[PDB]
Amino acid sequence: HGAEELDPLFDQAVQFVTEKRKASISGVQRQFRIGYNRAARIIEQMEAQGIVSEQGHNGNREVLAPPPFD
C-alpha cells in the first residue's frame, strides 16, 4: 500500500526530512504548507516507517532514514 495510509505529502516529507537530515512538524508545516495535525501525521507515519525517531526536544523529531539520492 501507500497513499491509502500514508499522507499525500509523506513521500515529499520523507525526502524533506532525509535531505535535511531533520524532521520537524513546524518545518514540514511551513515547507509543505499543511496544518500542524498533518505535519505531525506525516512525521507520525515516518515514525511508523522508521524514518523518524522518538521525540526528545520540543516538537523535534530525529531523522533515521537517509535521502532518496544521497
Which element (helix H / strand E) includes 45? Answer: helix 36-49
Residue 30 falls inside a structural domain? yes
Residue 70 falls inside a structural domain? no
User: Beta partners for 38?
Assistant: none
What domain range includes position 6? 1-64
Residue 58 falls inside a structural domain? yes
How many structural domains compose the chain? 1
> What is the tally of helices (H) and strands (E) in the chain?
3, 2
How many Å apart are CA 25 and CA 49, to the nearest integer? 16
Residue carrying the nine cell digits 505531525? 40
The closest of 49, 27, 47, 50 to 39, measured between CA atoms, is: 27
How many Å apart are CA 33 and CA 23, to the nearest integer? 15
What CATH number should be reported for the domain holding residue 48? 1.10.10.10
Residue 69 falls inside a structural domain? no
Residue carrying the nine cell digits 511508523? 48
Residue 53 falls inside a structural domain? yes
